[PDB]
Short mmCIF file of C-alpha atoms and ligand atoms in Angstrom, two decimals:
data_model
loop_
_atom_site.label_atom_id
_atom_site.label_comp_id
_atom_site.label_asym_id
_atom_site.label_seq_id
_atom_site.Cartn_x
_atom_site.Cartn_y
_atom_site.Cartn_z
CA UNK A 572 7.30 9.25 11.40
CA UNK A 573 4.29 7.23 10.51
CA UNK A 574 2.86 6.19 7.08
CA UNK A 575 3.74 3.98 3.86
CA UNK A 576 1.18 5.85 1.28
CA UNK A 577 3.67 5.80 -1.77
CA UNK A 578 3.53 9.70 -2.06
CA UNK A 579 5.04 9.93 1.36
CA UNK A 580 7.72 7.58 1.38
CA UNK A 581 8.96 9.55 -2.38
CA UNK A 582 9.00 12.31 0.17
CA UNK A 583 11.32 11.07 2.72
CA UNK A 584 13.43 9.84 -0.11
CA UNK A 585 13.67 13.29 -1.45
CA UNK A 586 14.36 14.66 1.69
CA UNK A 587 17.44 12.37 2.55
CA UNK A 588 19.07 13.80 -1.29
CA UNK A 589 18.34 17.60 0.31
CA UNK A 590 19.23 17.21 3.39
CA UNK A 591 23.00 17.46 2.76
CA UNK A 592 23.21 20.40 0.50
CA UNK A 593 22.79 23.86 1.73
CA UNK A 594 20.41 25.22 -0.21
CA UNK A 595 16.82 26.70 0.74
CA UNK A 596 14.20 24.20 0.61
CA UNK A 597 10.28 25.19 0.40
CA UNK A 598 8.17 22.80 1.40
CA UNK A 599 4.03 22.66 0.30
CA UNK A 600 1.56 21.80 2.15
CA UNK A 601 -1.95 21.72 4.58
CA UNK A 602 -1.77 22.69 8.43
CA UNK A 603 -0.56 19.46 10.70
CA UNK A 604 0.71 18.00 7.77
CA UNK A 605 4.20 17.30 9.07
CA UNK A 606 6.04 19.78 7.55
CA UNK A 607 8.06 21.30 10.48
CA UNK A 608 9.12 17.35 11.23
CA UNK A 609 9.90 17.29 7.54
CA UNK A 610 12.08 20.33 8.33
CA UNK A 611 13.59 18.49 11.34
CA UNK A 612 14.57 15.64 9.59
CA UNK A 613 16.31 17.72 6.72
CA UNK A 614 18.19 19.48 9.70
CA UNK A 615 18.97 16.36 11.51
CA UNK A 616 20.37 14.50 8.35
CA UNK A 617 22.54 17.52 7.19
CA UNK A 618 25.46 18.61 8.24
CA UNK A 619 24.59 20.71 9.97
CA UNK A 620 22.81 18.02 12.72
CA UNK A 621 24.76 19.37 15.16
CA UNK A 622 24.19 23.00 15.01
CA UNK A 623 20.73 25.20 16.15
CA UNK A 624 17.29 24.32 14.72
CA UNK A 625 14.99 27.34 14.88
CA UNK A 626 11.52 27.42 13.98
CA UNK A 627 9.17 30.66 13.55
CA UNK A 628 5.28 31.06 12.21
CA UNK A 629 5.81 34.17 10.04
CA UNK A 630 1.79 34.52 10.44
CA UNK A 631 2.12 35.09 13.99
CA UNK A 632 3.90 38.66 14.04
CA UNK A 633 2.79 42.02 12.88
CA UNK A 634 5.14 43.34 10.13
CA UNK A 635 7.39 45.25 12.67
CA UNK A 636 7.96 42.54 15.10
CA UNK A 637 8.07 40.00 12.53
CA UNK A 638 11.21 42.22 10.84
CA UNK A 639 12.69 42.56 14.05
CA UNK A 640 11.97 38.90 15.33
CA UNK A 641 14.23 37.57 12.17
CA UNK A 642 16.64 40.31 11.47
CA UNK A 643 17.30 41.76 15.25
CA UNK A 644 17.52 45.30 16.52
CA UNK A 645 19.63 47.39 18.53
CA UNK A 646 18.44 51.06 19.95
CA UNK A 647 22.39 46.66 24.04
CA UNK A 648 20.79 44.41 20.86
CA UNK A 649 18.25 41.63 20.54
CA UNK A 650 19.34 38.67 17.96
CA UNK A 651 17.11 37.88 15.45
CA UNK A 652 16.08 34.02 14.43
CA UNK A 653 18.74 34.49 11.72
CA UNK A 654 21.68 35.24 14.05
CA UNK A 655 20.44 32.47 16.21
CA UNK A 656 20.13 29.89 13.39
CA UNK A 657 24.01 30.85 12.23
CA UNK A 658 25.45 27.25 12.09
CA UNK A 659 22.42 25.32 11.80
CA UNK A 660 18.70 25.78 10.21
CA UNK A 661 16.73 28.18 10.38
CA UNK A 662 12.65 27.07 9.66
CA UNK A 663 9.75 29.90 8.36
CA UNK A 664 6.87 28.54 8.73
CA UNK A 665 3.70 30.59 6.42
CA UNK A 666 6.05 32.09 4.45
CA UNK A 667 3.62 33.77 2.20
CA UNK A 668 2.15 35.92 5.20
CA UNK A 669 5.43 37.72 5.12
CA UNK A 670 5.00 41.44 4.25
CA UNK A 671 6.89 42.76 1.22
CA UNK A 672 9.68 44.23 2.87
CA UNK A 673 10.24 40.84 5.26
CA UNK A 674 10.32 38.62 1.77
CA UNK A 675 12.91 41.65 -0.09
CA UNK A 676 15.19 41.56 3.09
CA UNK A 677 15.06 37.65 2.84
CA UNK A 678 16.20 38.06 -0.32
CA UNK A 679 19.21 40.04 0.64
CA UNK A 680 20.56 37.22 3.20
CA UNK A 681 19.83 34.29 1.05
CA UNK A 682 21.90 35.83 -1.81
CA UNK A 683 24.61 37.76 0.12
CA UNK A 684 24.81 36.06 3.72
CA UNK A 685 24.71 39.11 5.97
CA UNK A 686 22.18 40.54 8.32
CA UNK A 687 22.78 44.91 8.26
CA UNK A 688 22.59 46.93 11.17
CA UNK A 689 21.14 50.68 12.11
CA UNK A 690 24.09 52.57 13.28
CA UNK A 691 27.76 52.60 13.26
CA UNK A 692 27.91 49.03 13.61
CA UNK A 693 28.91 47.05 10.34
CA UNK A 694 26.01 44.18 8.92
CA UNK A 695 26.15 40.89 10.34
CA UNK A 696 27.30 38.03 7.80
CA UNK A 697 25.54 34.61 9.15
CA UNK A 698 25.35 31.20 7.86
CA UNK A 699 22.30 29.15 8.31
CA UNK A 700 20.68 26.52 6.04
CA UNK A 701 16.56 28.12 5.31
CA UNK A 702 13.79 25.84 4.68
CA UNK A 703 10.56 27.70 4.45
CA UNK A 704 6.43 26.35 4.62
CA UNK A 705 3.06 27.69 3.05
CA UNK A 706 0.45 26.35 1.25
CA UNK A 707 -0.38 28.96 -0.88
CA UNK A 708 0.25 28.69 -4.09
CA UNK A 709 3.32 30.74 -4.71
CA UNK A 710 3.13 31.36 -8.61
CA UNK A 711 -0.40 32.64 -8.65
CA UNK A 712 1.15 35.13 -5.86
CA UNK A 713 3.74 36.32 -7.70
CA UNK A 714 1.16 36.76 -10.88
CA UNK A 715 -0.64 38.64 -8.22
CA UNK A 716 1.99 40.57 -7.12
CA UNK A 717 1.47 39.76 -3.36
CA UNK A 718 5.05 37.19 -3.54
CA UNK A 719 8.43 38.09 -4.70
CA UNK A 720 9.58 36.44 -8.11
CA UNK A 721 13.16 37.58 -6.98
CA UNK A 722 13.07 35.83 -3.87
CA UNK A 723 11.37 32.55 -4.80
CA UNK A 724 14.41 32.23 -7.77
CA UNK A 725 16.53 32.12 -4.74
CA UNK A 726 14.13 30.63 -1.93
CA UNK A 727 12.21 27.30 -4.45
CA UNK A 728 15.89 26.00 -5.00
CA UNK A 729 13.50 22.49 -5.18
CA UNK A 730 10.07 21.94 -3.54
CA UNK A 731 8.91 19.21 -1.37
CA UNK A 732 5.35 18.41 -1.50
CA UNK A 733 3.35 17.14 1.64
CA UNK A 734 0.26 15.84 0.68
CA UNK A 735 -2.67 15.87 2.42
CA UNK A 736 -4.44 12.96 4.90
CA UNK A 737 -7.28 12.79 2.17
CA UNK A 738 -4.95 11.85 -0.66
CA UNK A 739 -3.28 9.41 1.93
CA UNK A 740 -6.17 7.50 2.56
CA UNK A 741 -4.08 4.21 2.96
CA UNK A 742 -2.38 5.80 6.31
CA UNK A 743 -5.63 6.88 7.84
CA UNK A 744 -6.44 3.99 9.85
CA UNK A 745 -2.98 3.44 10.38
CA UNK A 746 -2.09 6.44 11.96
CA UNK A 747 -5.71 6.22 14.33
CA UNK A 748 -4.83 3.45 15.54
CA UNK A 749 -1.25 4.47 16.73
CA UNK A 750 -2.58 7.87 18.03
CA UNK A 751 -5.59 5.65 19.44
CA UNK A 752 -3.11 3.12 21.10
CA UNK A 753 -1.27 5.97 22.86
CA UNK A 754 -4.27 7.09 24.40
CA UNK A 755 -4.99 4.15 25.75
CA UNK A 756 -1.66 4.39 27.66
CA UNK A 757 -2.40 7.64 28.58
CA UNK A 758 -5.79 6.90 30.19
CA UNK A 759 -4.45 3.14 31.59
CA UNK A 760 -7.09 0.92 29.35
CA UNK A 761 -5.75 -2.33 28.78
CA UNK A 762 -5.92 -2.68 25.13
CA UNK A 763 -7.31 -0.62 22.23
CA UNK A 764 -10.68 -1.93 21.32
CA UNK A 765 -10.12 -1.86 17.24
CA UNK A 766 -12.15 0.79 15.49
CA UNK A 767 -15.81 -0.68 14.10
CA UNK A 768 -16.93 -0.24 10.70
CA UNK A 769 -19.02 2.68 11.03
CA UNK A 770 -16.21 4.61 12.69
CA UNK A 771 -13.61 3.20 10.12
CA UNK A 772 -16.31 5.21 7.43
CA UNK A 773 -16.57 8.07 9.68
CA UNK A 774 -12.74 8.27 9.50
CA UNK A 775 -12.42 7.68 5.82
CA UNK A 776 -14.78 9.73 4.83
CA UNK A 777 -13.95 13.06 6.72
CA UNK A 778 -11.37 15.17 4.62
CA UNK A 779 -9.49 16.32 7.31
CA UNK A 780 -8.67 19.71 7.08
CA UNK A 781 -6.49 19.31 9.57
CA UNK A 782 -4.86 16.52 9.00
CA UNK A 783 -2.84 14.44 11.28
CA UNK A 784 -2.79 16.97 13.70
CA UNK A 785 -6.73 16.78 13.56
CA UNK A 786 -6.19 13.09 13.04
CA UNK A 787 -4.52 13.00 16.83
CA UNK A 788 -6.69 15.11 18.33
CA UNK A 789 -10.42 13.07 16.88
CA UNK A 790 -8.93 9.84 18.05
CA UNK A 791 -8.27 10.88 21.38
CA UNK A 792 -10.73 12.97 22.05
CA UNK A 793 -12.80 9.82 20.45
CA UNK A 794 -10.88 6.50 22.91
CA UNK A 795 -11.77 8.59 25.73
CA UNK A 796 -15.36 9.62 25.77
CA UNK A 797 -15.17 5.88 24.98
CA UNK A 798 -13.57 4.74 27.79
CA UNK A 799 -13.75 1.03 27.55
CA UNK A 800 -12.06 -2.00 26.29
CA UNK A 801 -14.61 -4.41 26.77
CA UNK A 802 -15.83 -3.26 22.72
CA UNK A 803 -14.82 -1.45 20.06
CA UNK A 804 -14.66 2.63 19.42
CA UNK A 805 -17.98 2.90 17.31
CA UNK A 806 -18.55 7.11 17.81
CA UNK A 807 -15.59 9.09 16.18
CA UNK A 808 -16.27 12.72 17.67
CA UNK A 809 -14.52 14.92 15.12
CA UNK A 810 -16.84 17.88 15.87
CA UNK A 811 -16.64 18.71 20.43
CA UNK A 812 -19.11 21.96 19.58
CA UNK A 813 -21.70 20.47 18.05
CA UNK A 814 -24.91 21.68 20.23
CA UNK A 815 -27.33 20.03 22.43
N1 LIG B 1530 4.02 11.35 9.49
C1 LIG B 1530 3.73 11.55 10.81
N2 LIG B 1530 3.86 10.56 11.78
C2 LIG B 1530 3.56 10.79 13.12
N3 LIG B 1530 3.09 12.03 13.62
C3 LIG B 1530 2.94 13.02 12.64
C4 LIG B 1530 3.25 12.79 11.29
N4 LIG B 1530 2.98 13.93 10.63
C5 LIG B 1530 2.55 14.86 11.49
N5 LIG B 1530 2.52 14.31 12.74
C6 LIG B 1530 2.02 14.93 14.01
O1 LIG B 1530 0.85 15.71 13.71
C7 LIG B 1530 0.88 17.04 14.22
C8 LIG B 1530 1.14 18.00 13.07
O2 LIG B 1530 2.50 17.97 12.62
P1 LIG B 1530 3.32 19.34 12.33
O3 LIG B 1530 3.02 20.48 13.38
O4 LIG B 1530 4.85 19.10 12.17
O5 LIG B 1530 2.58 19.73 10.92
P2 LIG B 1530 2.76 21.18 10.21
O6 LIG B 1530 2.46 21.08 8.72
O7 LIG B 1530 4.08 21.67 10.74
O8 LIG B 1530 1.50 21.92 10.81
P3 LIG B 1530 1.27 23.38 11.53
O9 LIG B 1530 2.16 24.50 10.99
O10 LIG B 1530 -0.16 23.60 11.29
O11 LIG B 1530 1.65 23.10 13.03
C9 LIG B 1530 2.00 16.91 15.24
O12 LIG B 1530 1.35 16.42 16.40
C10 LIG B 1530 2.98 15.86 14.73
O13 LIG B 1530 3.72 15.12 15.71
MG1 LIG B 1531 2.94 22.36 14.47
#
């Protein structure tokens, strides 16, 4: 993982004290701000390394399919994420798109371990380690009464916050210029140019609202229209639909 901005490397530190307990962890932040790697690495340095990592994006699924995407359904039965996490972690990413009822059956495994069932068969006890992404801001949820107090006194066991590109301004050019070296690679140019002033303020200066991800996808976008190794990269395209 790149980056030495001070507020990220007190990140990875907190991380590597999580990791080995098995309590939920919520992490904070911005899309493409690393949090599902962030959620990686707690898996990988757990004990639980060895077992399943599963990821969803609660934001993805209507309220049905998301309920029946991480607790299952029979009526001979389709596993939830939750049955398929049992062993290892289990990662929910936009955690405060979950309807009501998703967030109160959350609840009910974090506290009791056990996934019920429709029918004569008996509820399902699993064991999987949940760490859980948004950036919304939780507490003004629950004032609003869109977020579950009950379940974030179980899920925000303790908090790790990602910060955003623009309040790591020190890894900027640091990070373009790995993403930009890999493009070269990609598209066989000899050696990355270096980045001229102009695009160096063009880089600083954007506040990335999609941060690294939108970091990546600039620079490359940006080396290739470039092309060339004979100067530097000057033009920093971060906007492809700007008109005529
Ligand atoms: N610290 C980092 N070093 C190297 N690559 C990074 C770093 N942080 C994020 N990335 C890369 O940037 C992109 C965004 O990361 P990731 O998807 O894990 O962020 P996210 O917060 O999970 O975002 P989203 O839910 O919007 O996908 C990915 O291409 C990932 O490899
Ligand atoms: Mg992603």
């Amino acid at each position: 993982l790149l980056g030495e901005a001070n507020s990220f490397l007190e990140v990875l530190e907190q991380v590597s004290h999580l990791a080995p307990l098995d309590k939920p962890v919520l992490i904070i932040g911005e899309r493409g701000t690393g949090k599902e790697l962030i959620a990686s690495r707690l898996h990988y340095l757990s004990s639980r390394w060895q077992g399943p990592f599963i990821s969803l994006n609660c934001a993805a699924l209507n309220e049905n399919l998301l309920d029946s995407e991480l607790f299952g359904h029979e009526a001979k039965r389709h596993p939830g994420r939750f049955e398929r996490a049992d062993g290892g972690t289990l990662f929910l990413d936009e955690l405060a798109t979950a309807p009501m009822m998703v967030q109160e059956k959350l609840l009910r495994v974090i506290e009791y371990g056990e996934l019920e069932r429709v029918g004569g068969s008996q509820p399902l006890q699993v064991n999987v380690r949940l760490v859980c992404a948004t950036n919304a801001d939780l507490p003004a949820m629950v004032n609003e009464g869109t977020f579950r107090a009950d379940l974030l006194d179980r899920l925000a066991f303790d908090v790790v916050q990602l910060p955003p590109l623009r309040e790591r301004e020190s890894d900027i050019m640091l990070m373009a210029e790995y993403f930009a070296i890999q493009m070269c690679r990609e598209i066989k140019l000899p050696l990355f140019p270096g980045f001229t002033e102009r695009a160096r303020e063009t880089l600083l200066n954007y506040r990335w609202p999609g941060n690294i991800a939108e970091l990546k996808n600039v620079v490359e976008r940006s080396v290739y229209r470039h092309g060339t190794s004979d100067y530097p990269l000057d033009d920093i395209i971060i906007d492809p639909f700007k008109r005529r």
